[PDB]
Structure formats: C-alpha cells, structure tokens
Design a protein around this ligand. Structure first.
Ligand SMILES: OC[C@H]1O[C@@H](O)[C@H](O)[C@@H](O)[C@H]1O
Ligand SMILES: [Ca+2]
Length: 137
C-alpha cells in the first residue's frame, strides 16, 4: 500500500525558470511539459524547485521524472530537503545517472513534510529540468 498525493493539491516554485518551463509544469501530470532553468544559462547551479504539498504529509517516496526528450538539465547531483512545522531539514542527497529514467527516492521511515525542495547541484548543460514530480504516502 502506497498513495499518490494529488498534484492539484500542490503548488510549485523555483529559483530559476524559463518562461516556457515554469515550476508549475513540474506538477501538471503531463510528461511533455517540464520545469527548466533559464535557457540562456544565466542562473548557474545550484538552483532548486520547491513543491508545497498542501498539508502535513508523511512521505514514503518521491518520483522525479526527467524530460521525455532531450538531455539538457538531467540532474546528476542533488539534495532533498523537507519543510515541517516549519523546520527545514536535509533528508536525501546523492548522484543520478545521465538518462531519462524516472529517479526514485524512498524513505524507509516516512518523513513528515508540508513542502519538499529538490536542489540541482550539477546537471547536463549546466541546467536543471524536471518534467514530472510525484510524492507518495
Ligand atoms: O538552451 C537550453 C534549451 O535548449 C534546447 O535545445 C532545449 O530543447 C530546451 O529544453 C533548453 O534546454
Ligand atoms: Ca509536466
């Protein structure tokens, strides 16, 4: 048993976004639209995407769907922080491969969080992109 938090209950924000690729496009249920930092490369990494969850949640996993086409912004090095009451705390970090496969992060002990922040430390082309982000309880 695991349950998907409705993305419609989420709101998204990013420190860098191309006009065509806003933070909100990371949570619209469409793998053809992405969040992407600004194409002109002016916002050097790290850049981040914050997703507010709507209420206090107990999250057991996160699925990070890369762009369905192209490679620019495949995140290769990341951090994940959670915001709860309203303390911010580092909860995941590592390296991801250079491909378009969904990247999962699982919490054996489910974490309390009202908001999650994905920080892209390194990414291809010096960009960060996420086509879809889902959060599971
Ligand atoms: O300049 C950066 C841009 O490059 C394009 O080729 C790509 O389709 C966009 O997603 C964006 O990454
Ligand atoms: Ca999307």
């Amino acid at each position: 048993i695991e349950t998907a938090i409705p993305q419609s209950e989420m709101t998204a924000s990013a420190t860098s976004e191309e006009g065509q690729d806003p933070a909100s496009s990371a949570i619209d249920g469409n793998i053809n639209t992405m969040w992407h930092t600004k194409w002109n490369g002016s916002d050097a990494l790290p850049q981040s995407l914050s997703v507010n969850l709507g209420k206090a949640r107990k999250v057991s996993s996160i699925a990070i769907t890369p762009r369905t086409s192209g490679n620019n912004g495949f995140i290769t090095k990341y951090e994940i922080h959670a915001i709860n009451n309203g303390v911010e705390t580092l909860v995941a970090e590592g390296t991801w491969e250079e491909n378009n496969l969904v990247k999962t992060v699982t919490f054996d002990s489910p974490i309390d969080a009202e908001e999650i922040k994905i920080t892209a430390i390194q990414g291809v082309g010096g960009f960060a992109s996420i086509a879809e982000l889902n959060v599971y309880e």
